[PDB]
Amino acid sequence: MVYSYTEKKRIRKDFGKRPQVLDVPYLLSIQLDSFQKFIEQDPEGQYGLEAAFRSVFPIQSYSGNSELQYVSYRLGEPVFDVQECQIRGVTYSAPLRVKLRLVIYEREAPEGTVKDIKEQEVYMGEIPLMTDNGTFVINGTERVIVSQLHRSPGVFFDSDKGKTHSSGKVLYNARIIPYRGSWLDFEFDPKDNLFVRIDRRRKLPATIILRALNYTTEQILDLFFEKVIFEIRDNKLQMELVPERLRGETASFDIEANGKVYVEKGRRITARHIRQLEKDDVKLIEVPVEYIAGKVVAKDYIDESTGELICAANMELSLDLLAKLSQSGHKRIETLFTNDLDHGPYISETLRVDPTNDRLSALVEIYRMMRPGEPPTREAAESLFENLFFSEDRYDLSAVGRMKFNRSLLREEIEGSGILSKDDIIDVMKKLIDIRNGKGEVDDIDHLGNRRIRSVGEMAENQFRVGLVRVERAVKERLSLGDLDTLMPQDMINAKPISAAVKEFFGSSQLSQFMDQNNPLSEITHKRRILALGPGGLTAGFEVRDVHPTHYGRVCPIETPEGPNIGLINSLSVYAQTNEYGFLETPYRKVTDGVVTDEIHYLSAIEEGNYVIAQANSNLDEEGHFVEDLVTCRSKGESSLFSRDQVDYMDVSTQQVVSVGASLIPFLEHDDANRALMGANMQRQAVPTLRADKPLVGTGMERAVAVDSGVTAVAKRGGVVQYVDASRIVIKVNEDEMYPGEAGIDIYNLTKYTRSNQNTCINQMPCVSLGEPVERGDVLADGPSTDLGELALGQNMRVAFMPWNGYNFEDSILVSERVVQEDRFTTIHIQELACVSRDTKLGPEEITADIPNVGEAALSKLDESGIVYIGAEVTGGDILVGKVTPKGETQLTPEEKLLRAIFGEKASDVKDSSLRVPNGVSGTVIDVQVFTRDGVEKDKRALEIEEMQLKQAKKDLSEELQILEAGLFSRIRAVLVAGGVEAEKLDKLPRDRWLELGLTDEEKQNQLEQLAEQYDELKHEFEKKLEAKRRKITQGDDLAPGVLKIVKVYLAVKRRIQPGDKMAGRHGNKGVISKINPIEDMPYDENGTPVDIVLNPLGVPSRMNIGQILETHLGMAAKGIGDKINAMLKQQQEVAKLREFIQRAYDLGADVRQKVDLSTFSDEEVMRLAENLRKGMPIATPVFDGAKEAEIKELLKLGDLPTSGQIRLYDGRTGEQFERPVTVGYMYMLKLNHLVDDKMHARSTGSYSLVTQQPLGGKAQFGGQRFGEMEVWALEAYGAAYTLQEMLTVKSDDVNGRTKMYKNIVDGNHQMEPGMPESFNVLLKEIRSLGINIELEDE
């Protein structure tokens, strides 16, 4: 708040105007928040383990009045901690202990229990735990669960116009989608017949479900249709007329009452005629006996005398039928109100296609639909249909389902029952008919109000629920036969069944995946990710991939993969949040009257719909009145100019449209969206470097990405640094931030060189120095690819745009040797290689160091036990772990046998299985771990390690206690000196004896007490932490069946940079370093300074990304401000001269949001800042709020450098000039990890597959390249027959020709005696194994 302590070290000069009202929230919100609701104690039905329990519980037996209910649940402390869980390889998890209650009701009650045994916390399963950074450790490997996006449950009405039947006419269908349970589909057809289908199953006439709800034809007709009353009064047929019935119809006869003819025959009744009837209140008219020939009678009508049915309900009356129901004494006849435009006569004709009659009939016809071919049964059909949509067990919409359902049905209640009601289905049918009638619209799936966001917590809740249903069958099953007091709620509820539902998700699921950890941006951008397909959903359709108007501020427009799934991923936006109900909402600013108010307001996708939202980029001042009389705004799905005082809200930030990825691209507004996608897409691939650099050109998010992702080490509490080691950092907490008891100091243990998921190096460095004040929320130590708390994914360098003798040809990059000499793009890789000693039927394999047919030079690098020493530098082929496996009676041959007689060698009974270093990769062994089966005797090396780990543990634990004790006694010293101060007196006697001295009556005596209590706890907690650690060490690690022991060697390879490596800027510019050029031949400027990289200018115009050029220019300028300081610092001008110029930099001409110094202390503080600025002056280009040409050229003026951004350069070869200026500057460049010595493979003769003999890599010497169909055509188009035969015969599939060929290649005869490929030879046996006789004819 006016600048922090690690902010005092380096300040980034920030262009841009718009004040930031809201700051990037926690970027990990979604991932962390979700799992927090799942595992939690919620004193109610809110989603969580509590809620999932209350669903399946209590489980009661069948009538047996033996019930097993659920009390409460708890999470025990984890079995191993995160670090240990990772080393050993098991999952980081907590035991779930749930208190259960077994009640048995007396048989033939009044209900009362003979006995209820309460089983104390029966253990069911171990549910996994989430890291403080939101990853899970499944087996020793960090994993993220991606959030999923699906269609929210409720009711949804779609169209399906066009393609169906090609007659036009559209169609209208309704769909009820519950969170769990069967789907209910309603749909029309070309004849305007309403249909229903359960799941995707057979279509059934809609009315048939209503019958299953116990609705007779009369009440179904009575539900969906209005009543036309026909009166026989005096004689021949009167009728009631609602003056509104005549709209949209042409008069069919003389309509007359009250001695006045309102409408004549053939004149349609428009609003005028209707007005006359309405205002004249004409209730009853006289109608002809011929008008009812088409009108459908409503209820049943029988002849009172013969007691026989004259006409059944839903039958068309005729002029003759009126006679037969008129002479029976009927005054009134009810008919349907049917209008082909407003209220359609659909259901009436739907009944005519209905094969069923009564409820049992419909239930029969439904059950035979779901499970056909087998005879339906009454108890079965009734049970099934009641179990589909109406049972709390097999169906739930939950709250969101019920809420969106009721909300879309235009109801009041926003929360309700989790099942369907007769009212609900009838109401849904009513809504579908209303849309077909022209009133109402269909929703669209792509809108984010119908698109809901899941995440790990919700998924696990569902999975744990599944464990509970499959244990449920068991609980009832046992409670079926149970003896009274013998069994308890333990013998019944199992573990494996419940535990295995959750374990299968995190273990193998499309949503649990290796964290993309090559990179801090990689981590944080993976943890924020969306899916639109995956497991639960549609695993053509381009509509959903495309960008939607609701994506603004919710989903990133430009960060999505370019490929098979485009728009199928997205990423979460910068300020986006999971809605209370699970939608996606974005921040906004409330505009009351004419002022832009700083109250923030979160609007969901549908909430935002009706409001008018101003633009993030708008001009206001003073009181915050919109400067212009009209401002660009967007209201409902579209944007246009809006009046001064109209706007309800305004964008929070200029950023909120994009994502954390896109927000890191400087001058983004200047890059074409295709290359921008590619840019934000490639930035996650930057492998970290040896020297963490820092971006010279930036946005200002780099701090948030570094800190919010856990790669770094952040100060818990402020204080002064007591101790700084490359290992740990110990902070003496300030008293204002400190708790009363135990005092304290925060001991931060730094991560050291270690393997990332992608086999990159993740290593932390201390960024503060001994005894320096640090404030809460300050960066304590940098992580990989972070600088002084900011995010550096690569290293900026001097770049020149110009063709260099074609070495930059396509995207190829020409890099000076200076880059590789400076070791700046170097990368450290950590590979985990393993050696397993298994069990075979011939015998166990030994890890012994005695290996057949290897020299003393081979076995040198191994110890007595057979494992390579720590620190031994190794190369390709070197032996990491000696291993030998039994193979008996080799059965050699005559000439081999003579060979052994001459050279007198005893051929061993053991085969060489030793793990040896992969070919070509060379590094230093930085570690060895040895896991041994529990019960096999630990070997020498393994034993040394155990002792080593034991001693190392003790120093660490004691170290904790040692610093802790001094920190506590140092506080006792201060409290004892107030009120009883003895300065020299107190510190003479042994420190341990201080605790006796009490104090005068005061709270300080109670403070001394506190520190006492916490002291002794620490004394003992240390004891217990040490004991547990020791046991975890000595316990034999559990291994697989058959595995006696496993040795993991950890190699640290340092790869630098070479032709073939991938490099890219933030702007979507790829490249492959082509040649590495001497510093002598590099283009240089008049000053004699070479240039690091020569990029091709030709890549810029075609791909329109101009930011890369601004990024270059400003970069050059930034470097300018640095160089200038480097001169004033190398001149040691003074604090005064430097202070002036630096203030000059931070202002830069007008109207920026930066502010700045001369508050900073002119001596110790000012000089340190300039020293950190001397490399270049760090600059901030906000995303859409970013710098401008004028600001950039002006910074170049302060630079002493031309505005052009171009200089004179000289070819280092001829020493002669270059015609024209070339643009030189500093472009930030990432090294992606595609590095050529991963990708490169070659094979001569490798191993081969058993099923079909074909090249297959078994040594990781990769199987040969795959020759495809298209590649075959290419040989056929050329005339090359023999190249093709040798490709698909001798080189691959021919078990003979390969060997017959190989002997000739060395023999010096190039030929092939191809024979028949084993592929076809197999097809022959396969066809012939069928009843097909396939022979090869003739000769």
Partner: protein, 552 residues
């Protein structure tokens, strides 16, 4: 067959075959036990079902494998698949003596060769190396030969140059489309893990340097070596089979060089002087006396073969420039000097190669084509062409055109509020006036950008085609196009909303200026649809070629 950790794994036929055997065996038994009719019929029906599941599964009940949900794969499913057969179908069998890796440039290569990583070649030619090692007697036996190259003994590298010398390798790229997707090269041993690919071929393959990876195949048998050299060889296919035009056309950097080489400004060093021949023209340029492009008369000797198979000679004073004089040094024999006397863009530079092929034949076109590349890259390098931010020039009248076209839109708006025009008639009107503006601004920055170098020779003024960097790129044909330049300086387009409509408020700014949130957000739909369309239409095209090669 067994696996590690002692578990076993086997084909699904076994689960199937076993059942057919069992039911069959039980049935045999049920006859000797004389079971009732109701049973032997049922056993017979059961036997029928198992035979069906073994043979073709899925035509009755779809039997599921033991303990495993997935229906067990049957004999019909072993032959069958997606599509037709698994054996030859994409894809399509793995093949020995191969490799692959990331590719880089190698402008040094002659058009017939390629950079092959040292290490790739050692493992690739391994049997050849072994036999040659003991053919010359540097290795006692094949085993010792293994140990020598396995040791990478210094003597083996020289033997590898032997096995490499005349021995082509096949290079292949990823979406093999026409037969040119595989071409033979002569390998040149290269330190490093990257494959180097002649730039001129990069076009036929559709191969970038942004990390595309390529595969190598060794032509083992003698018939394959002469096939590789005589059919699939690079130098033997220089022309696309779709149309006889050369596919070896100089690419981007090279054509920007020749464009900068043969070009002329109004006043330049050496203007007006005369030189004996191309030789002293180059002597003038490299020595710093004369500018590369200045109007100059020089004596040249051209040739026309207009005799009957015979080269005529004719010499004259041609009025030309210094650069064109120097470039003439590459052009072989019977081509007239006329071909290099023009400004030499990418289009003319292809027809140069074409005529060279149709007059002097193959061999001269190859060695010529190489030369064009070398010289193209080289002179382009001297030129110092670059792209700065001040290189993209926005028209001075732009703010005025947008403002004038914006009045039109508010006029049609006045007509719609007054009902003078229908909603649709309005919409169409506004779309057009905005449309006219785009053309107006575009052909504005193009006139200013194109000719604006305005210079003085001994007199007052004159104006020529601009020498501005970004313009040279588009005139030459190297990269960029009037459409893309227009997006940089003049306004860019009217984007379109996803449903296919076109927004009636174009993007009035461009990339030299900023695009704001809305302008950028709206651009997003076009980009997003763009990427999908190429990626689906890429796949859609392939399906077509499949159907096509099948019918022929």
């Amino acid at each position: 067959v067994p696996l590690d950790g002692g578990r076993f794994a086997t084909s699904d036929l076994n689960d199937l075959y076993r059942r057919v055997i069992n039911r069959n065996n039980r049935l045999k038994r049920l006859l000797d036990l004389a079971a009732p009719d109701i049973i032997v019929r049922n056993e017979k029906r059961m036997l029928q079902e198992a035979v069906d599941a073994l043979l073709d599964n899925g035509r009755r009940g779809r039997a599921i494998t033991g303990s495993n949900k997935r229906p067990l794969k049957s004999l019909a499913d072993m032959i069958k698949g997606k599509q037709g057969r698994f054996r030859q179908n994409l894809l399509g069998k793995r093949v020995d003596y191969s490799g692959r890796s990331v590719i880089t440039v190698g402008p040094y290569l002659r058009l017939h060769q390629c950079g092959l990583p040292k290490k790739m070649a050692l493992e690739l030619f391994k049997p050849f190396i072994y036999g040659k090692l003991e053919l010359r007697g540097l290795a006692t036996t094949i085993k010792a030969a293994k140990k020598m190259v396995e040791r990478e003994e210094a003597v083996v590298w020289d033997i590898l140059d032997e096995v490499i010398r005349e021995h082509p390798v096949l290079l292949n790229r990823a979406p093999t489309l026409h037969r040119l997707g595989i071409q033979a090269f002569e390998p040149v041993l290269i330190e490093g893990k990257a494959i180097q690919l002649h730039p001129l071929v990069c076009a036929a393959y559709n191969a970038d340097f942004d990390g595309d990876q390529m595969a190598v195949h060794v032509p083992l048998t003698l018939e394959a070596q002469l096939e590789a050299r005589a059919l699939m060889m690079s130098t033997n296919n220089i022309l696309s089979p779709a149309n006889g035009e050369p596919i070896i056309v100089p690419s981007q950097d090279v054509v920007l060089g020749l464009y900068y080489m043969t070009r002329d400004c109004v006043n330049a060093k050496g203007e007006g002087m005369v030189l004996t021949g191309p030789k002293e023209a180059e002597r003038l340029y490299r020595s710093g006396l004369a500018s590369l492009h200045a109007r100059v008369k020089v004596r040249i000797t051209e040739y026309e073969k207009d005799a009957n198979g015979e080269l005529v000679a004719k010499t004259s004073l041609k009025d030309t420039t210094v650069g064109r004089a120097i470039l003439w040094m590459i052009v072989p024999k019977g081509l007239p000097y006329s071909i290099v006397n023009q400004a030499l863009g990418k289009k003319a530079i292809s027809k140069m190669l074409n005529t060279c092929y149709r007059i002097l034949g193959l061999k001269p076109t190859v060695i010529f084509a190489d030369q064009i590349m070398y010289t193209g890259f080289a002179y382009a390098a001297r030129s110092g062409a670059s792209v700065g931010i001040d290189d993209m020039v926005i028209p001075e009248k732009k703010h005025e055109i947008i403002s004038e076209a914006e009045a039109e839109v508010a006029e049609i708006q006045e007509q719609f509020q007054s009902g003078l025009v229908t909603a649709g008639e309005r919409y169409n009107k506004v779309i057009d006036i905005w449309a006219a503006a785009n053309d107006r601004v575009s052909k504005a920055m193009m006139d200013n950008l194109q000719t604006e170098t305005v210079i003085n020779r001994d007199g007052q003024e004159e104006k020529q085609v601009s020498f501005n960097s970004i313009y040279m790129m588009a005139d030459s044909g190297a990269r960029g196009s009037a459409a893309q330049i227009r997006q940089l300086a003049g306004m860019r387009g009217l984007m379109a909303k996803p449903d296919g409509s076109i927004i009636e408020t174009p993007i009035t700014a461009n990339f030299r200026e900023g695009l704001n949130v809305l302008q950028y957000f709206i651009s997003t739909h076009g980009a997003r649809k763009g990427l999908a369309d190429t990626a689906l239409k890429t796949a859609n095209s392939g399906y077509l070629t499949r159907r096509l090669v099948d019918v022929a």
